[PDB]
Amino acid sequence: RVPILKVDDYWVVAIEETLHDQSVIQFKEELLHNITGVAGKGLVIDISALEVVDSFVTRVLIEISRLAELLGLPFVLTGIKPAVAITLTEMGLDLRGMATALNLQKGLDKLKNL
Amino acid sequence: PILKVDDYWVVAIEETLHDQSVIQFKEELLHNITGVAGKGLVIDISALEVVDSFVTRVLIEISRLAELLGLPFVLTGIKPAVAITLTEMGLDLRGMATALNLQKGLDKLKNLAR
Numbered sequence A: 001r002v003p004i005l006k007v008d009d010y011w012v013v014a015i016e017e018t019l020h021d022q023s024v025i026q027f028k029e030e031l032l033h034n035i036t037g038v039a040g041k042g043l044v045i046d047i048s049a050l051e052v053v054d055s056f057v058t059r060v061l062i063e064i065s066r067l068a069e070l071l072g073l074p075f076v077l078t079g080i081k082p083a084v085a086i087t088l089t090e091m092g093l094d095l096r097g098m099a100t101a102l103n104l105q106k107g108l109d110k111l112k113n114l
Numbered sequence B: 001p002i003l004k005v006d007d008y009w010v011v012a013i014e015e016t017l018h019d020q021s022v023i024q025f026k027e028e029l030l031h032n033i034t035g036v037a038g039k040g041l042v043i044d045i046s047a048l049e050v051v052d053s054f055v056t057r058v059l060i061e062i063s064r065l066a067e068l069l070g071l072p073f074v075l076t077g078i079k080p081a082v083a084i085t086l087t088e089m090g091l092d093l094r095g096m097a098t099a100l101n102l103q104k105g106l107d108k109l110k111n112l113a114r
Helices: A021-037 A055-071 A085-090 A104-110 B015-019 B022-033 B053-068 B081-088 B102-110
Strands: A004-007 A010-014 A042-046 A075-078 A099-101 B003-005 B008-012 B040-044 B073-076 B097-099
Touching: A004 A021, A010 A021, A010 A104, A021 A055, A021 B003, A042 A055, A042 A104, A055 A075, A055 A085, A055 B003, A055 B008, A055 B102, A075 A104, A099 A104, B008 B022, B008 B102, B015 B053, B022 B053, B040 B053, B040 B102, B053 B073, B053 B081, B073 B102, B097 B102
Parallel strands: A010 A042, A042 A075, A075 A099, B008 B040, B040 B073, B073 B097
Antiparallel strands: A004 A010, B003 B008
């Protein structure tokens, strides 16, 4: 549903605009199942297609940031905005101590200086 | 907050723990993991360089809460230093399962179900 790709041992995900809460969860459960079952070098998630953010999206994004930090998985969030960065820092995302990039490419490159 | 991967509950623990009561903590943890039961519970104390009497108390309590719920259980992220202390203060570690990090613990909790 939400496609999880893997490009050169890196996990790559782009989140589009959603309606069913229950596909984000299908995505999160699926992603967290993937990044634990077999080895990886990092995880880039792009949220450029999202013009706003639920607390639901915000808290799933926090959940994956905290679990990758626990798995020693480099994590980059990309495609961030005005009306996203603000609510993200609001609901509790340490954006300043988080690896962030402008697009899917800058993130891949950023998961590679390490 | 609380994390969950693969039907497995994960409590990551930080030095900000000393700011509620053990009892408030147990009531908080039971709110989260008894709603829908899990196949297990991983407690991560990797963020702990220093353990005191309060922490050992919680760890002792949570480990017991777990089995009371019929819940398989790994204590992960123990500095070899913060582990003698824990046992000196009453955490019978020999009885319970331990793992290096969230990953090895997750692997132990499930590669024990095959």
